Amino acid sequence: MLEAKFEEASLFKRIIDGFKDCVQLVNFQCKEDGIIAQAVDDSRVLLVSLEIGVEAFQEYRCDHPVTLGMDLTSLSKILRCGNNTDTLTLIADNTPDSIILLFEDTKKDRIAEYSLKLMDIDADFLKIEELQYDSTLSLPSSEFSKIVRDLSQLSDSINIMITKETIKFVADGSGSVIIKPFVDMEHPETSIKLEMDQPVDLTFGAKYLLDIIKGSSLSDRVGIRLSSEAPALFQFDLKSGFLQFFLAPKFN
Amino acid sequence: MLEAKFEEASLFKRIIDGFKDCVQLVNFQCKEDGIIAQAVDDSRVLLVSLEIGVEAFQEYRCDHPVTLGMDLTSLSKILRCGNNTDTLTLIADNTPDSIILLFEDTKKDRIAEYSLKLMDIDADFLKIEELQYDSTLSLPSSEFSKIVRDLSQLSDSINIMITKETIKFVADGDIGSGSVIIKPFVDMEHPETSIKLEMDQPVDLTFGAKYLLDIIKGSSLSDRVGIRLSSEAPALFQFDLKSGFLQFFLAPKFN
Amino acid sequence: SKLAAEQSLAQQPWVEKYRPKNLDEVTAQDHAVTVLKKTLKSANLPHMLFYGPPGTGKTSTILALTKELYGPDLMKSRILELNASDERGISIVREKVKNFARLTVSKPSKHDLENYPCPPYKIIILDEADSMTADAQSALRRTMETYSGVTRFCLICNYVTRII
Amino acid sequence: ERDNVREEDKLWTVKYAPTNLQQVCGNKGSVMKLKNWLANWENSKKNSFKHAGKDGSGVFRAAMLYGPPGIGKTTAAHLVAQELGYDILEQNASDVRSKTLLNAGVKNALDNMSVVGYFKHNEEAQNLNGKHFVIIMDEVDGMSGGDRGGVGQLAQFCRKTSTPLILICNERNLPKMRPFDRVCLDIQFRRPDANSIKSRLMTIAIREKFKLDPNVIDRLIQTTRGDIRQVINLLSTISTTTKTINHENINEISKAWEKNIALKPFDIAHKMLDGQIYSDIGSRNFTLNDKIALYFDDFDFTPLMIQENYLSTRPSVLKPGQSHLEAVAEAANCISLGDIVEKKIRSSEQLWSLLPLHAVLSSVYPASKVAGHMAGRINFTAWLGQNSKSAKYYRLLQEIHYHTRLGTSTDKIGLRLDYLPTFRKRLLDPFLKQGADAISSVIEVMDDYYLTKEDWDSIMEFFVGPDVTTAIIKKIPATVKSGFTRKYNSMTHPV
Amino acid sequence: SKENLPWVEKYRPETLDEVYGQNEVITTVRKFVDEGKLPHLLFYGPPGTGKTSTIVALAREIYGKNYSNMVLELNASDDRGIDVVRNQIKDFASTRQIFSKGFKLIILDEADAMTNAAQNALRRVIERYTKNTRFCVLANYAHKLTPALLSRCTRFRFQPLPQEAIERRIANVLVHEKLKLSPNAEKALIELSNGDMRRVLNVLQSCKATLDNPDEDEISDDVIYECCGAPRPSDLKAVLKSILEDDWGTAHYTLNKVRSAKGLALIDLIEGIVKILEDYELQNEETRVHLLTKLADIEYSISKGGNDQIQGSAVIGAIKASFENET
Amino acid sequence: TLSLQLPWVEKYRPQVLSDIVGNKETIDRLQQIAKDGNMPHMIISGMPGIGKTTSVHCLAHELLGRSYADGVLELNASDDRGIDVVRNQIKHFAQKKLHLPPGKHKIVILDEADSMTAGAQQALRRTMELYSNSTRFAFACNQSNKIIEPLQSRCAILRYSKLSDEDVLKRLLQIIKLEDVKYTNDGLEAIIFTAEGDMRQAINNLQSTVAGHGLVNADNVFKIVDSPHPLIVKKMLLASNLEDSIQILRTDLWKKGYSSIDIVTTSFRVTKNLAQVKESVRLEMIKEIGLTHMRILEGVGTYLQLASMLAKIHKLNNK
DNA sequence: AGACACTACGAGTACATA
DNA sequence: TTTTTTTATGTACTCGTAGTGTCT
Ligand SMILES: Nc1ncnc2c1ncn2[C@@H]1O[C@H](COP(=O)(O)OP(=O)(O)OP(O)(O)=S)[C@@H](O)[C@H]1O
Ligand SMILES: Nc1ncnc2c1ncn2[C@@H]1O[C@H](COP(=O)(O)OP(=O)(O)OP(O)(O)=S)[C@@H](O)[C@H]1O
Ligand SMILES: Nc1ncnc2c1ncn2[C@@H]1O[C@H](COP(=O)(O)OP(=O)(O)OP(O)(O)=S)[C@@H](O)[C@H]1O
Ligand SMILES: Nc1ncnc2c1ncn2[C@@H]1O[C@H](COP(=O)(O)OP(=O)(O)OP(O)(O)=S)[C@@H](O)[C@H]1O
Ligand SMILES: [Mg+2]
Ligand SMILES: [Mg+2]
Numbered sequence A: 001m002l003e004a005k006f007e008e009a010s011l012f013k014r015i016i017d018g019f020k021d022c023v024q025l026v027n028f029q030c031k032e033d034g035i036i037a038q039a040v041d042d043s044r045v046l047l048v049s050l051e052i053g054v055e056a057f058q059e060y061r062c063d064h065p066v067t068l069g070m071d072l073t074s075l076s077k078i079l080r081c082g083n084n085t086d087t088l089t090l091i092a093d094n095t096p097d098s099i100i101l102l103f104e105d106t107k108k109d110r111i112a113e114y115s116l117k118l119m120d121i122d123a124d125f126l127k128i129e130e131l132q133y134d135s136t137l138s139l140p141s142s143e144f145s146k147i148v149r150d151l152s153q154l155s156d157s158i159n160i161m162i163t164k165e166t167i168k169f170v171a172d173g174s175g176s177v178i179i180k181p182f183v184d185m186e187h188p189e190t191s192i193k194l195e196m197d198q199p200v201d202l203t204f205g206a207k208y209l210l211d212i213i214k215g216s217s218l219s220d221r222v223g224i225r226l227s228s229e230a231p232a233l234f235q236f237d238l239k240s241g242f243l244q245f246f247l248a249p250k251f252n
Numbered sequence B: 001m002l003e004a005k006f007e008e009a010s011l012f013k014r015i016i017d018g019f020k021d022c023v024q025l026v027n028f029q030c031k032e033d034g035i036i037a038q039a040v041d042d043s044r045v046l047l048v049s050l051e052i053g054v055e056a057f058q059e060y061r062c063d064h065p066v067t068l069g070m071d072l073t074s075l076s077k078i079l080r081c082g083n084n085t086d087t088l089t090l091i092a093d094n095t096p097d098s099i100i101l102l103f104e105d106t107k108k109d110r111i112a113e114y115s116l117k118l119m120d121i122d123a124d125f126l127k128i129e130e131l132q133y134d135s136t137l138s139l140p141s142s143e144f145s146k147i148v149r150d151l152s153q154l155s156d157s158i159n160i161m162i163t164k165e166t167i168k169f170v171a172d173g174d175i176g177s178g179s180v181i182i183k184p185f186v187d188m189e190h191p192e193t194s195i196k197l198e199m200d201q202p203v204d205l206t207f208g209a210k211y212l213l214d215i216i217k218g219s220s221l222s223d224r225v226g227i228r229l230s231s232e233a234p235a236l237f238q239f240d241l242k243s244g245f246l247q248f249f250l251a252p253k254f255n
Numbered sequence C: 001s002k003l004a005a006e007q008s009l010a011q012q013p014w015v016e017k018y019r020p021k022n023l024d025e026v027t028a029q030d031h032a033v034t035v036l037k038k039t040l041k042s043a044n045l046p047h048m049l050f051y052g053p054p055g056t057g058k059t060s061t062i063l064a065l066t067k068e069l070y071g072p073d074l075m076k077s078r079i080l081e082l083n084a085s086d087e088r089g090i091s092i093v094r095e096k097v098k099n100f101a102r103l104t105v106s107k108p109s110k111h112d113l114e115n116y117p118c119p120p121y122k123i124i125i126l127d128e129a130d131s132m133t134a135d136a137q138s139a140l141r142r143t144m145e146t147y148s149g150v151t152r153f154c155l156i157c158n159y160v161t162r163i164i
Numbered sequence D: 001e002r003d004n005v006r007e008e009d010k011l012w013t014v015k016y017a018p019t020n021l022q023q024v025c026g027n028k029g030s031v032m033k034l035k036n037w038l039a040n041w042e043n044s045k046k047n048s049f050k051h052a053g054k055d056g057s058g059v060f061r062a063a064m065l066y067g068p069p070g071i072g073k074t075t076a077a078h079l080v081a082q083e084l085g086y087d088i089l090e091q092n093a094s095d096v097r098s099k100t101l102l103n104a105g106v107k108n109a110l111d112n113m114s115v116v117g118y119f120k121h122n123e124e125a126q127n128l129n130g131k132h133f134v135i136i137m138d139e140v141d142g143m144s145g146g147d148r149g150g151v152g153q154l155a156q157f158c159r160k161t162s163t164p165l166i167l168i169c170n171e172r173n174l175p176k177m178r179p180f181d182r183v184c185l186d187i188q189f190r191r192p193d194a195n196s197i198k199s200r201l202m203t204i205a206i207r208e209k210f211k212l213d214p215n216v217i218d219r220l221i222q223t224t225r226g227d228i229r230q231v232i233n234l235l236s237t238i239s240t241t242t243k244t245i246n247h248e249n250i251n252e253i254s255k256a257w258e259k260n261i262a263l264k265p266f267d268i269a270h271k272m273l274d275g276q277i278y279s280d281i282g283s284r285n286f287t288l289n290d291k292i293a294l295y296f297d298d299f300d301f302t303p304l305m306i307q308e309n310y311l312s313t314r315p316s317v318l319k320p321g322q323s324h325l326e327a328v329a330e331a332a333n334c335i336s337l338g339d340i341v342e343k344k345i346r347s348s349e350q351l352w353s354l355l356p357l358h359a360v361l362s363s364v365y366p367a368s369k370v371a372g373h374m375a376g377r378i379n380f381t382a383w384l385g386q387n388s389k390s391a392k393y394y395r396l397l398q399e400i401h402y403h404t405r406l407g408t409s410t411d412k413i414g415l416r417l418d419y420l421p422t423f424r425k426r427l428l429d430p431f432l433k434q435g436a437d438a439i440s441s442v443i444e445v446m447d448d449y450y451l452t453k454e455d456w457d458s459i460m461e462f463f464v465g466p467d468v469t470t471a472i473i474k475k476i477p478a479t480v481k482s483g484f485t486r487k488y489n490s491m492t493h494p495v
Numbered sequence E: 001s002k003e004n005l006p007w008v009e010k011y012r013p014e015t016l017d018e019v020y021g022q023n024e025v026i027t028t029v030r031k032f033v034d035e036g037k038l039p040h041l042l043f044y045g046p047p048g049t050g051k052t053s054t055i056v057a058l059a060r061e062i063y064g065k066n067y068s069n070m071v072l073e074l075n076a077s078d079d080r081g082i083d084v085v086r087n088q089i090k091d092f093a094s095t096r097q098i099f100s101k102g103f104k105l106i107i108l109d110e111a112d113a114m115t116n117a118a119q120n121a122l123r124r125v126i127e128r129y130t131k132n133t134r135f136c137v138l139a140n141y142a143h144k145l146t147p148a149l150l151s152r153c154t155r156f157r158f159q160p161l162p163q164e165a166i167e168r169r170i171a172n173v174l175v176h177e178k179l180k181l182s183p184n185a186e187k188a189l190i191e192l193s194n195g196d197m198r199r200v201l202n203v204l205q206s207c208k209a210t211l212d213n214p215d216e217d218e219i220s221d222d223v224i225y226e227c228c229g230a231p232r233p234s235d236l237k238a239v240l241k242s243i244l245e246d247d248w249g250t251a252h253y254t255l256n257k258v259r260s261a262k263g264l265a266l267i268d269l270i271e272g273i274v275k276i277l278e279d280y281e282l283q284n285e286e287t288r289v290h291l292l293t294k295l296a297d298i299e300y301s302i303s304k305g306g307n308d309q310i311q312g313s314a315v316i317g318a319i320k321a322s323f324e325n326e327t
Numbered sequence F: 001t002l003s004l005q006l007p008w009v010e011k012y013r014p015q016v017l018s019d020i021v022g023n024k025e026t027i028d029r030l031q032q033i034a035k036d037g038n039m040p041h042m043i044i045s046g047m048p049g050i051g052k053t054t055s056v057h058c059l060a061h062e063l064l065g066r067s068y069a070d071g072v073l074e075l076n077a078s079d080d081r082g083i084d085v086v087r088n089q090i091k092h093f094a095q096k097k098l099h100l101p102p103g104k105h106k107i108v109i110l111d112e113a114d115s116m117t118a119g120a121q122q123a124l125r126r127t128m129e130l131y132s133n134s135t136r137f138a139f140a141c142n143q144s145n146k147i148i149e150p151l152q153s154r155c156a157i158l159r160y161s162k163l164s165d166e167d168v169l170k171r172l173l174q175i176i177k178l179e180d181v182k183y184t185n186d187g188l189e190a191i192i193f194t195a196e197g198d199m200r201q202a203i204n205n206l207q208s209t210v211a212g213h214g215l216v217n218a219d220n221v222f223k224i225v226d227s228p229h230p231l232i233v234k235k236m237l238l239a240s241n242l243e244d245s246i247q248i249l250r251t252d253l254w255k256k257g258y259s260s261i262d263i264v265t266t267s268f269r270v271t272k273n274l275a276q277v278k279e280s281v282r283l284e285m286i287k288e289i290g291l292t293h294m295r296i297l298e299g300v301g302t303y304l305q306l307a308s309m310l311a312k313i314h315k316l317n318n319k
Numbered sequence G: 001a002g003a004c005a006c007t008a009c010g011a012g013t014a015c016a017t018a
Numbered sequence H: 001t002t003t004t005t006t007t008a009t010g011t012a013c014t015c016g017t018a019g020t021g022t023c024t
């Protein structure tokens, strides 16, 4: 029997809306540390994982770890009924054939429960052991969303180049944006950091990046880890955990 | 003869919008007290009953009780050709014939005289809502519309339960199950947000969602929906106009 | 007005120039027009089905009857003539014919009630009913059976077997 | 708890499904061909699919599998994909598959690698193609079809792809499946052999504590008509009550599990024209109701197929004192009566309740009149192509008549029968006798009736019999034709 | 007012006691509604037998004067598709009544014109909602209804109205109207009805209008025959005798004068001669085969037009050639 | 008249598989399957009124126990069953997680499966193949030919046959014992004769006779229920003399209110399903019946046309 | 005040028909 | 062993410009 309580439903609503279009079914594991959930795209090209710890929950009770396989469309329809001023509460019993989303209002006597029926998903939970990424850079998420929206309107394939402490986002008419790593003390949020080991050459699609950049609402800074023989990792920070995206490159 | 000159134009437009795609054939009755019209749904499930007195009209003159039947589609077509700044005037001759809808502008001489040909409907005017109700309640329009069109996405049926000082709307479907529990409370700085409830016996009964989604369309007229429920009695959903009232009689499902 | 119509009739073919305008001009079809004249004083005109060889005067008889009933003023407002040159499928029969039958009869003027009987019903005539499909014909059944108080149906055909 | 599976909870179909390629029953050639085609896929891609080997596989970047349902196409494809070290991306008709949907979801995977291949295995490089995709599109014949739909999108995707594209369907010779005629390597899974299915049945029988003799498996297969899945389901369904079926209860088992499948528009022609069916013994076995259901299997081609090849058989039901010509004439008379009935059916009033009658007059009676042996081969109905050709010629003649109405003032048929025998000698004949200096006369003649070059070319195609211009136009010297077509685009013509 | 409705509509039965002809069905239906056990009804019968009147009077007896509101009446005039079923009929069956307490009644009048998909969707609506609503299907042809839908309702066959019932209704009308009728005229009226009350009422109104008097006289057979344009048995038998006995020219002249003096139709004469020759006891059935075949062919040709004189001569020659074998 | 009672077809509707008097083999098969579990995909076909829907309902009920409400998805022909429904709702139910006993499975009952569109039937293939370990499909139809072969290949095929006189008589005797109704042997025989292997029609006619006359007698049964339509038509067509067939057509069919279209359709069906005469004679009879039907449909439907059809049939039978 | 997700009424395309 | 066919109402699916309530 798990019982978790947020401070406001807006946090979980935005967390779900960040990746609501890349996957339809997702397995939320529940341990004593927190909630971890990874979901692979229907085309198996984009893997979206997330981890939220106890710091984001007002109350957290998880006696035993349990995996809840739930859809995102029905969960979105359910969460759309809740208000931003309500205290969301996720409740689950033993053998959780369903999950209760309880909305409490603090200044009115209104209690809105929504019981959602979980799915039976093949939980092939792959390990996320750390791989030494060749390049690890970080830049604000808003400019990332803008540049991806810019290159998306020109073509579908987007090539990323990490070379000689320079970042290149090129779309093949043919457009190109070149980024320099400059650290600013007066504005620590726009500090575009970069640690490069090998020059990396990656190539992704349009729709995947367009759906990844829509999650640029939880963190003002996104970290990009790239390797020639490993999928790119786009990490967005949270108040307690983090939301990572794993995107596969294109052929050469 | 009949002369019903409104004060404005959008009033009757919103009045017909309240149940535009809800019923089809209506039969208005104009008497000395005002216009009263009851209309049964195509599937004979709900009954719309509207009563507008002599208060909402700027001028009212009715010699004898007149009965004018009409289809709501043609009435909507006629009413859409009128400007929202015009003045509406319903005219009827001695015997019931095509009702004259007159649009008269206030600044320019614009005389838009449409003639809507009547229907011949069986005037089976019954006497309803003269029965005692087991539970009565009242709550804001926006809250009811929100609850209805939020529970209609989880199922096609909505079970209303009135227990001792407890209102409950339950929606049990396939993809999920929702339940909203509002409690009676009366505020003093905002007397319109109060949710009053006078219950004599517990009530448990289900309705369809396709009909509640059309009933909530009448929330554009008033802001305090009254709901009267009882065992084996038509659910009364009443919107209170400034002169009359618009009440939907919904039939409960069969458990 | 009247003189223009007289001149137009005088400059028309003899088939249309000498078309019977009253129920007395018909010469040989006396059995039907006798009932049509006797029901003109009463108000119980039933649903009628004219059938026979071509050129016997069915359309002329029904036109003269509608004229003698309604006058040249209500002749254009209390009639519904549906010929074979129009669409008469299930959709037309269900929408247009049923909406006209459900309509209330038009109020006669002061000059109408002084010279003509002005019955409390209207007439929906369907000329050349042979071309009407069986489903569109079966759709007319309850349409003509329930709204008989306000409308009257007049079918016209050559082969009575083509009608259900 | 959830991962714990129970063998008494799985069907005999899935609990005994092949886990390796060596367990598939029959059709070894097709499975081996698919394996060789998928093994040599990257080697072909390296050379832009130009190099071709002895197997003939390597030029088509995509493969299609077609056959009856339940023979192991999907299982074979999945097993080959798993044994060749590839990542399976399987989609089918159960998921929304349209043009827009395929462009949104799948189009972004024809040139993009997988994302789980990295997470699966990276420490040991077993194969470089482990990071590659295989697109197994099952139930291709279940798409919507038409001009708009995912069928054409997949057909065009089959031309430009960097990942193997396997297609699985149950019906290959379909109009919607027409764009796939020359773009992918077609493999046909046929009726499996009785020996492999017999061994598999013996195995699943001794495993399930079920008694079975090998003498019944042949009958089971021939009543099932090549579907191991239905045989397995039959065994699982009947084994729960009867634990032994050798020679006693097989009659009712076969009579209760007979496959009621619709015959192709060519098999109906063979069964209809079968003389044994209409014999005194065959009549009470294949009753008239079955003969009418035969027509009702496909009521759009059965009358045409009958009328096409009813006079191309050797009758064996000829009554004493009746020749073949008399039976053919009676069959043709009944064909004309069925023609009248069909015209009355598909006309106004929608007299479709006369469809059973059209069954007898158009198909059953003419076949019964001429039933017997098939002399040659069952010819496809040529009435459709002739109707299309006649419609095209009628359109052309209508254009010609509407062009020359300003001068002829005659009808379409009145111009085809009368004017063309003279228009031919006015336009074409001066070319055969006067060389290239009769060009001005022909131009003036075609101008006087507002004719065109395309109209001139279309006019000469209507004549038949002893007057065919298909060789006369070739006999004309090319210089004369060149001068004519050059003068056409030079002089102005008043429409 | 009711005095303006036609006699077919004016004399529509309002209670189950005014529905003559059907006694085995009416009594069983009354017992059904009295004991409460009312199953799904299927009134199958020819036009003008009294199915719609029966079900309307039944709904009136069940719900009172509130019939038009507690009953869902659908017919061919209304759009009846599969979506119409799914929405309207299912919502009417699933919910409760708005005005009183009791089961609901769905009258699917003329349901022989419904689509097969509509019946396939309705056959499970009848079986699922069967504790709060009922179904009554009216039909003239039982072949247009699927067997699944046909097996869920109790079938009541409305027989054609017999002599006694039509005579009773005629007497009721003659009491309601200031009209007198001759006995032989009444018999002839029964003969040209085939159990159709609509035809009887229509021709009765027509003969009352034909009287041309203040109705101080009686309606004889001549008035009826001149009203419906039907041939008299006298002229019928005279033409038949002239065909069977007289010469070709004499028979032709007799047929011409009989059909031109009274303005009779050739189809009516054909039907009358067929009805008369049905009682004729003849020799070997070849003559009957030839007669029936040729007369049906001539009737089918008349049903499409043509030369009336040629068809009359064809009738004469066919009858003569058929009776030429009975020697 | 304030409230009504449930009909005997619904009141005495079997709720256990033992009360079904249909085909003993398939009923015992379903009983053993429900007792052991592991219910496979099935397609039950037959004729109306023999116990197909009740059979699968009893199977699902006895197999799921109290979890019937949350484990059984019932979809009839009255509900939308297009490609969209199969894509969304059926797939959501098959993917829905539910903790069931270790011998049961979620059941998807599809009544009138012969009415589903081709797109929905095609989409259901992988839907039933990918979740065959937690979701099972039971189709109930009247014509197995309307369901595509790919769907039939993944399920068992149960063809229900007509109910013999013994089974219907036993069920009627059980209903009489449970109702205490006075009956007679000839009345029950007439009920079985007019039922034609239709149990539902038999129970309906029995209830009608009981509530209309009180005593179940052959006289009352024949008075409230006419003789079967196809049998009188068969007796008319099989007549040896033209006069006998004409008298039968006049008295039994024409004088009782049977329309000409129904008569000609029943004649066509009987001649098609006839087995007494040769194939060629049946073909000529069907040809003549269709020639007559072509005139009946044009509005020339009278007694003379049927008489001419009978005369032509007798002339054909006159060698 | 405005942009854009949600949405429901409408034109086009086929697909059967006992 | 293989291609097409006029029309008429009911049914189902699809894209889709459009009308309006809502959030950055
Ligand atoms: N009884 C009649 N008395 C006088 N003139 C007649 C009579 N019948 C026909 N006519 C003449 O014939 C013309 C045509 O009359 P119609 O009523 O159109 O014939 P019809 O019966 O309608 O034939 P159709 O339309 O082909 S079925 C009339 O305008 C008259 O000139
Ligand atoms: N050759 C075979 N040998 C053994 N089992 C087989 C064979 N073919 C089919 N099966 C069984 O049938 C099951 C399903 O086979 P599938 O390959 O999915 O059928 P299919 O040939 O693809 O036809 P579909 O699904 O209608 S397109 C497998 O899991 C096996 O249990
Ligand atoms: N048994 C009857 N007793 C008295 N009047 C009858 C009877 N049957 C028919 N009528 C008269 O005929 C009129 C029409 O009856 P209906 O019930 O409408 O005919 P029907 O049986 O429904 O056949 P349809 O409508 O052509 S399918 C009634 O209004 C009565 O005037
Ligand atoms: N074997 C049986 N034993 C007892 N009652 C039966 C039997 N078969 C049918 N019935 C009765 O018939 C009623 C309806 O049976 P159904 O199962 O609905 O008919 P069906 O076989 O499904 O054919 P359909 O539904 O028309 S396709 C049941 O409620 C029972 O009252
Ligand atoms: Mg005319
Ligand atoms: Mg497969």
Ligand SMILES: [Mg+2]
Binding pocket: E051, E052, E109, E110, E138
């Ligand atoms: Mg009726």
Ligand SMILES: [Mg+2]
Binding pocket: F052, F053, F111, F112, F140
């Ligand atoms: Mg059933």
